[PDB]
Scaffold this active site. Structure first.
Site, PDB file in Angstrom:
ATOM      1  N   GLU A  74       0.849  -1.308  -0.109  1.00 28.36           N
ATOM      2  CA  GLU A  74      -0.112  -0.080  -0.065  1.00 28.36           C
ATOM      3  C   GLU A  74       0.892   1.234   0.010  1.00 28.36           C
ATOM      4  OE1 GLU A  74      -2.439  -1.422   3.545  1.00 28.36           O
ATOM      5  OE2 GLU A  74      -4.276  -1.683   2.527  1.00 28.36           O
ATOM      6  N   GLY A 119     -13.393  -3.076   2.051  1.00 30.91           N
ATOM      7  CA  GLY A 119     -14.462  -3.901   1.429  1.00 30.91           C
ATOM      8  C   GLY A 119     -15.788  -2.850   1.433  1.00 30.91           C
ATOM      9  N   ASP A 171     -12.790  -5.588  -2.553  1.00 32.26           N
ATOM     10  CA  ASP A 171     -13.678  -6.884  -2.161  1.00 32.26           C
ATOM     11  C   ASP A 171     -15.026  -6.465  -1.902  1.00 32.26           C
ATOM     12  OD1 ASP A 171     -11.679  -6.424   0.375  1.00 32.26           O
ATOM     13  OD2 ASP A 171     -13.936  -7.279   1.159  1.00 32.26           O
ATOM     14  N   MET A 186      -9.901  -1.658   8.853  1.00 29.23           N
ATOM     15  CA  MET A 186      -9.348  -2.107  10.399  1.00 29.23           C
ATOM     16  C   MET A 186      -8.163  -0.732  11.073  1.00 29.23           C
ATOM     17  SD  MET A 186      -8.208  -6.094   9.367  1.00 29.23           S
ATOM     18  CE  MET A 186      -8.026  -6.578  11.202  1.00 29.23           C
ATOM     19  N   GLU A 187      -8.184   0.386  10.289  1.00 32.96           N
ATOM     20  CA  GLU A 187      -7.254   1.296  11.044  1.00 32.96           C
ATOM     21  C   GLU A 187      -8.053   2.735  11.012  1.00 32.96           C
ATOM     22  OE1 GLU A 187      -5.988  -0.248   8.104  1.00 32.96           O
ATOM     23  OE2 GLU A 187      -5.077  -1.928   9.410  1.00 32.96           O
ATOM     24  N   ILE A 233     -14.078  -8.959   7.720  1.00 32.21           N
ATOM     25  CA  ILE A 233     -15.558  -9.133   7.504  1.00 32.21           C
ATOM     26  C   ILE A 233     -15.458 -10.129   6.173  1.00 32.21           C
ATOM     27  CG2 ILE A 233     -18.054  -8.379   7.102  1.00 32.21           C
ATOM     28  CD1 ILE A 233     -16.135  -7.588   9.748  1.00 32.21           C
TER      29      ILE A 233
END
EC number: 3.2.2.9
Lengths: 230, 230
Positions: free
Chosen positions: A13, A79, A198, A174-175, A153
């Site tokens: 990333e 996501g 996704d 997640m951040e 997830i």
């Protein structure tokens, strides 16, 4: 204006933006990697944090105190919760909140940390600027609510539970909400600029292996062009 | 040896130890409060963090970098998972882990953050010393696994789910595993010394209002006596 902070979780990333720097230079503290250089004529500091809420809060605290940035930009993958989004599309935050915090036994709202606000707000002038940029580059995008937690997830059951409790949420990761909580404590302006890897369902793990690279190209192309306007 | 760090979440949990200092002195940074002074002949720094994982990680990062402590002690209250424990009993950590982290779609263990160890280990020499102290004071105590998350566990349904996934867990709370993750990243020794306020079931909220003060007296009495041995 004069100093820009950029933060992403994984090597895939941050690698595209690091290779575009002239006069690169590297610095290490605990687990965190920092890269100082020049991008499109402005000085920047690129930060590789690690995954989840505690790793993102340690990296953000050190960034602010050592480098004194004027603004902080979060880049990378996520996501989709909204049915109108496809793989590759750009995601711009308005507000951010936790999907996995529960102190309701004491009367607080679902998602709220005791004694803090219900949600954190991104900077208006940065939202306005980046929406104009995405038009010029011809890349499909959307502004909305992003939610964070310490889980990936990857099932229909997990996804349905999140959409019933937060019906206006557009995407999940997640951040972002941990970095926003840290910027609120020290008063520094912040925005999120990520892209879809996704659709957060029973296919999520196979989609992520195929499309992680594609989401880092979309996301990095938009952040490069925004820095050239600041 | 020469510098001791002490960290608790709420005003009720730090007030007893702060009133025992001679030559107290106070310092502010973002939301965090620090109190410097002398306790039983050693120099200490007392820290009030706020509630949950992100607030505890910001406070710990600043403590380490500004004050350079030789060890870190976490004090306060928690909920009992073991059926042999009563309100007031002392809790000493061996290892610590998350009950609410799920990246198993990628093959990691239940509770594990991607790229980190499964659990974090407390310092052996501090565990040995504090077990001897609790005997002299005549206070009932137990050594074992403590688990953390960003929720208050106040129902039979929540409790049963945690005990099936982690059958050796002895108690549950909201900061200890975040403080341990931060000490691992910078290499500083750490131990937890808390006490029971509630039994983590449908009575948890009414127990906590009645017994928060009692658990802070038990916990603070043990930490005062340990500092006099270091």
């Amino acid at each position: 204006g004069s100093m820009i902070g950029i933060i992403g979780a994984m090597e895939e990333e941050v690698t595209i933006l690091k290779n575009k720097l002239t006069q690169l230079s590297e610095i290490s503290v605990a687990h965190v990697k920092f890269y100082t250089g020049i991008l499109k004529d402005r000085e920047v500091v690129i930060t590789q944090s690690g995954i989840g809420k505690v790793n993102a809060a340690i990296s953000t605290t050190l960034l602010i105190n050592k480098f004194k940035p004027d603004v902080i930009i979060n880049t990378g993958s996520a996501g989709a919760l909204d049915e109108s989004l496809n793989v590759g599309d750009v995601l711009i935050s308005d507000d951010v909140k936790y999907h996995d915090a529960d102190a309701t036994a004491f009367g607080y709202e679902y998602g709220q940390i005791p004694q803090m606000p219900v949600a954190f707000q991104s900077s208006k002038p940065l939202i306005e600027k980046v929406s104009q940029v995405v038009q010029q580059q011809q890349l499909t995008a959307k502004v909305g609510l992003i939610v964070s937690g310490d889980s990936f997830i990857g099932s229909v059951e997990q996804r349905q539970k999140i959409k019933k409790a937060f019906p206006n949420a557009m995407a999940v990761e997640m951040e972002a909400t941990a970095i926003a909580q840290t910027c609120y404590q020290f008063n520094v302006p912040f925005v999120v600029v990520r892209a879809v890897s996704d659709l957060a369902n029973g296919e999520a793990e196979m989609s992520f292996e195929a499309f992680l690279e594609k989401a880092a190209v979309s996301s990095s192309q938009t952040v490069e062009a925004l820095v050239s306007q600041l």
